[PDB]
Amino acid sequence: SLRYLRFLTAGESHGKGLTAILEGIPANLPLSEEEINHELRRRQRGYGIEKDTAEILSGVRFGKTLGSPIALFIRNRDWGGIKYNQRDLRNILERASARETAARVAVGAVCKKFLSEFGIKIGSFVVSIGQKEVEELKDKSYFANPEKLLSYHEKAEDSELRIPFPEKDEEFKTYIDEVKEKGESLGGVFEVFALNVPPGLGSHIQWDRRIDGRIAQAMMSIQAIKGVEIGLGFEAARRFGSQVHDEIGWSEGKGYFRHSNNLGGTEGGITNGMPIVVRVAMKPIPTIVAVPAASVVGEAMLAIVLADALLEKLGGDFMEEVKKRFEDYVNHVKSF
Amino acid sequence: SLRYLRFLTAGESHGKGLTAILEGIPANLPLSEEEINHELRRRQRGYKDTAEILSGVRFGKTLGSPIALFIRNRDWADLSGGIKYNQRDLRNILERASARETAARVAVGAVCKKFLSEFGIKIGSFVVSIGQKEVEELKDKSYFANPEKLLSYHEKAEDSELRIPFPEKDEEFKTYIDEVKEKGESLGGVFEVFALNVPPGLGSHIQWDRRIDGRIAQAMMSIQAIKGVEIGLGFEAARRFGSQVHDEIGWSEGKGYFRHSNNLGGTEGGITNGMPIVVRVAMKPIVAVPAASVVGEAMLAIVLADALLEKLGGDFMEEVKKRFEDYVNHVKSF
Amino acid sequence: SLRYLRFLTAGESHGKGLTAILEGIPANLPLSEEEINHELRRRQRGYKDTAEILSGVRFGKTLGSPIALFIRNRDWEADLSGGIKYNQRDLRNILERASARETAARVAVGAVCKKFLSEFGIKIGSFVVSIGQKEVEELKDKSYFANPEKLLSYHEKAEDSELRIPFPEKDEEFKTYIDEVKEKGESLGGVFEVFALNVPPGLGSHIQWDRRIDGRIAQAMMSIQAIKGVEIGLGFEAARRFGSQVHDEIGWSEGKGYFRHSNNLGGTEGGITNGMPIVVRVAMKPIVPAASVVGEAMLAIVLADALLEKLGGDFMEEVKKRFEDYVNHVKSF
Amino acid sequence: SLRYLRFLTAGESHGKGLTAILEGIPANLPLSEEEINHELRRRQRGYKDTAEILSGVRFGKTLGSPIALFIRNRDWADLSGGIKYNQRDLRNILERASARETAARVAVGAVCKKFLSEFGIKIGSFVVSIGQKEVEELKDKSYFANPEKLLSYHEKAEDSELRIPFPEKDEEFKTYIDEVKEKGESLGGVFEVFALNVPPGLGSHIQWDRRIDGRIAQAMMSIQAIKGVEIGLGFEAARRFGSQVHDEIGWSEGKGYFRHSNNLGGTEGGITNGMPIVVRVAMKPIPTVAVPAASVVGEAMLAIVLADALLEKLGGDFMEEVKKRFEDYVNHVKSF
């Protein structure tokens, strides 16, 4: 459950389409269908007219948000059972199917646009598919390196499997087919990150306000996701406090920061100022690798949580107002 | 957050005490302070604490009104929180962020456990690793589908000083801990929490925030020092073939639907499937993992009590239990 | 807000159309676009509108998933406070969403809740009680608040009235008066009453301020554009009379259980419904028949929410069975 | 209900006492038990209650954490509730339903009032009628647009044993009441609660549940015995012509944009307009004169709603932060 933003999605996999209504994004935010469609396209190319497109039904005029609810519709074009008493599990799968994640990505696309206005960037990349892992990423020191993270995301965009090293593509494509010929499905793991998130988002005062918990629900709620780690995660539970602890640093023109990021950008339920890093595990599908698409949905979920948490801290009804409060707050952080 | 129950905790680590208010538990539920104190003691034992019921209970039974609890303090997030709340006197945040707050959580959880027991639902847990030392016997997770095994591990854990399923290894672990403590070092750990006899159908796939897996993930990860959470096999499942993770569906007269394995941890597509709910939680170093496991039980009880009430609704046990029976028969007879 | 149901509406007055998403209605509830349009039309006559079901319904029945509706604004070919609030220099951006046109989406959502409610024998209706200084005299005495037959009858006649007044015969007196005031540079507001029949006792709760059914109905009604006043039962009049005068004496009978001899309380006691007709009086300031139709929708939403809150359930059969078990429990208490 | 603040109250009429937890009040707000007790006393005189702060306050200031309050119970409807919760002993319902619960609401309301005072927002009320007897001088509601008059009526009311704006009429009302008492009768009443210096922009028109009027209506109508609520003129406005109801808009250099009258009650289109917020509340006869006490609870409820709406608009975790945003916003208002 979000604290500031509100949204609902609807639609069955084989129905007229998917509908979503997002409320809470401030007024005067430049927003276009192309920005939304771009994200929908990344998710589509993650499974391996046909292109998903969203039509804005309200909330936007002359390229800017009005401040009113934003409604989107995604045509399908190709146009549980016990709990709801549905003998035909089709009615259950229709709505359950990962088809619904497309609406999540559309809502997330709006949140990403909102976040970018504050210089906040979200990205991701696959680190393992089946038993084959991206060995270059076993050392997690890059969790504290914005340039590297961004670098890996950029390369993932040039990968048919969204892996940080496209050259490895052919190699991975081999292992995959080598497995799909044995009538076997594959799972995977990806990492999602957010850069330039100021310290102070989320809160330690109540269990449900902790940023980590919120991130956890958003990620684990994605279909097929069975595991989630913030930063080092389970590996951190096997190490010594000293080999996990992120050393605190400070500078005159920068304020406080950390020398490493094993915590994944959060400390005691609140963001660190360091990159937010989340590791997500997707179990093998059914029985067309889906981990790449999953990672794109992961970015959408993280953008929703962060946009929500940022608005919770800043408040505001129009961009000029929110941006001013962000600037004052960041100034307060730097000089603390 | 929750979908049916509502609660809030308050109090600083070194203040007068911890306060908690829980709303939504049906009326006529036998409840006593000992049942609460029992859980509070298990928490401290994992590293004197009692709770006084201030309202919501009369003649040993809930009135259906809000239940207020107070845990008197006998001895009467840092930095980021300091920046966040403009608190120069850092102790102002550390005070509320302290794991002492988890005591109020366990207090609330205790009431939820009692509620759940009325339906035969049992919650338990045990530590599987501390630092680099793991309980090798528990390496194979086949026991995720075995209610008897899970329960026995919990029971034995209650006799372990570190809540490990094999008390005879306490010295082997204690030596390791004392050893790491010899140096200037702290340790984290990993525990598994489970719920038995939970009916399929809890939670929902209709909306991302209603899926039971996300709700379990938030509750668990909201616990102090927790940095990782898995439902069932977890990250391990992500590395296997589809056929090695799949929990084949089985059915028999009377027993109804069930699964031959539980790599999924008791949930499928955002809803409980009838199998034991199993959650793996990773705690980073700050020893404290045993107390964390107890807190994990409380969080799981709260999420499940909430999910059960969301499905059944009702204002008094008699009413809620009748609905449970009809639903269960509906499940089997499906 | 709501305790079980969840919904959101969107759309600008002159945009492409109105959108709404409703979540929480049980599966297997018969639902058609015609049942929705029926209400949408009643709303317009209060001053075409057609709703397309985009999801949640298959083979005429609800799937249990979210129900999305779209009301296409076919001719697609206040202000200051919102302008300041949202930094909207062009106040049209505030007007487009604030417009009473938005109420159509609320009526569409309400229509679904009405159908859900009807599956339980619960009926929702309304009628106009006054417009300007002209009030319906025959209804001065509020004794009919405890008479389901009368309330239902007044609603029926209203359905034949151009201004939804409970006495079609008075249509001309009202229309004439309206034209007179309209002949001048003036506009009128009005009062209407909304009721719900066959609602069981126990809906809502007294344990927490935000769960009391009276506060929930009040927000729903007052949220309607131009509504400045709301009362449950006698309302402000009850505040003027003596205790013994407003008090609804409790009655009981073998084959009917507990009930009340009068309904000055409007079907609510201490935060809970008491079994009597739920009656709400609503005041709309100048610039009412259409508003009364919106009032029905809002009361349907709140009651459907309160019903599901008490019963739970994911499919009609399940809910209806818990209903019967609950009602029997009430009678034999 | 609320969108920013969160709180819960608990306790039975004759139990050990009343408990409450309020979350969301910013850090560094001066707060003492006497500020709370003062409000608790006003309530008692409306028919020594004292609250004990158990957390959320250190050195006279809020820490930013949840605020817990306990109100001792020294002495340490029913049917519908008895049926709903299957309680054969109707004393189990009366104990919680009892207007005794309002004491907890007033304690919560006190903290909110203090918060609101930091911004110059003032909340008050006064009784306008008891039984068939109403304060004639208040028949004309033109004083809704007069901050000074309203405040005056409230101060005068504080000198009345029936919180009526005209203390001289006390004996007059006392007798009338006494006469009604003789023939074994109970009386209801009508009071008006106002809020001064509230800026335009609180609440929203974008979604039904965000509109300020609706939020005020639930808060008020949720008070025991309340059967009616009006914002401004109310039902009387429904009986008037548009021109004799609408508040014409005026503009000036200072405090730009204002209204010439306040028939609307300080809200329009679901948003506060800067004018005084005025609510008229009707309380039925209890059971088969508590209207003065009811007015004090009405104040607490309006304060909670407004503090929540103000926080919703401003956001913020500490007072210095919230105050600058308020200043900036008001600056935006005056120059719009």
From Swiss-Prot, chain A:
Pathway as given in its UniProt record: Metabolic intermediate biosynthesis; chorismate biosynthesis; chorismate from D-erythrose 4-phosphate and phosphoenolpyruvate: step 7/7
Q: Name the source's superkingdom.
A: Bacteria
Cofactor: how bound: Reduced FMN (FMNH(2)).
Q: What are this entry's molecular-function GO terms?
A: chorismate synthase activity; FMN binding
Which cysteines does the record link by disulfide bonds?
none
Report if keyword Isomerase is assigned: no
Query: What is its EC class?
Result: lyase
Q: Name one Pfam family in it.
A: Chorismate_synt
Annotated residues for binding of FMN? R95, A96, S97, Q223, A224, G268, K283, P284, I285, P286, T287
Reported cofactor(s)? FMNH2
Describe the reaction catalysed, as an equation.
5-O-(1-carboxyvinyl)-3-phosphoshikimate = chorismate + phosphate
Would the keyword Flavoprotein be found if you checked this record's keyword annotation? yes
One GO cellular component this record assigns the protein to is:
cytosol
EC number(s) given by UniProt: 4.2.3.5
The entry marks the following residues as binding NADP(+), namely: R43
Listed under GO biological process in this entry are: amino acid biosynthetic process; aromatic amino acid family biosynthetic process; chorismate biosynthetic process
Sorted keywords for this record are: Amino-acid biosynthesis, Aromatic amino acid biosynthesis, FAD, Flavoprotein, FMN, Lyase, NADP
PANTHER family xrefs: CHORISMATE SYNTHASE
What protein family does this chain belong to? Belongs to the chorismate synthase family.
Q: What does this protein do?
A: This reaction introduces a second double bond into the aromatic ring system.
| Assembly and binders | Homotetramer.
What protein am I looking at?
Answer: Chorismate synthase
Tell me the gene name. aroC
UniProtKB/Swiss-Prot annotation, chain D:
Q: What is its EC number?
A: 4.2.3.5
* Family to which this protein belongs: Belongs to the chorismate synthase family.
Protein's GO biological process: amino acid biosynthetic process; aromatic amino acid family biosynthetic process; chorismate biosynthetic process
The answer on whether this UniProt entry bears the keyword RNA-binding reads no
Name the gene for this chain. Answer: aroC
The protein's matches in PANTHER family, at most eight in alphabetical order, are given as: CHORISMATE SYNTHASE
- Annotated residues for binding of NADP(+): R43
> What does this protein need as cofactor?
FMNH2
This protein's source sits in the domain of life called: Bacteria
Job description of the protein: This reaction introduces a second double bond into the aromatic ring system.
Family annotation (PROSITE patterns): CHORISMATE_SYNTHASE_1, CHORISMATE_SYNTHASE_2
GO MF, any single term: chorismate synthase activity
Query: Assembly and partners?
Result: Homotetramer.
Gene3D superfamilies in the record = Chorismate synthase AroC
What is the protein's given name?
Chorismate synthase
Which GO CC annotations does the UniProt entry carry?
cytosol
Keywords, A to Z, come to: Amino-acid biosynthesis, Aromatic amino acid biosynthesis, FAD, Flavoprotein, FMN, Lyase, NADP
- For the keyword Metal-binding, the answer is no
Which positions does UniProt annotate for FMN binding?
R96, A97, S98, Q224, A225, G269, K284, P285, I286, P287, T288
Associated pathway: Metabolic intermediate biosynthesis; chorismate biosynthesis; chorismate from D-erythrose 4-phosphate and phosphoenolpyruvate: step 7/7
Q: Which reaction does it catalyse?
A: 5-O-(1-carboxyvinyl)-3-phosphoshikimate = chorismate + phosphate
> Which InterPro entries does this entry report, sorted A to Z?
Chorismate_synth, Chorismate_synth_AroC_sf, Chorismate_synthase_CS
Cofactor stoichiometry and binding remark: Reduced FMN (FMNH(2)).
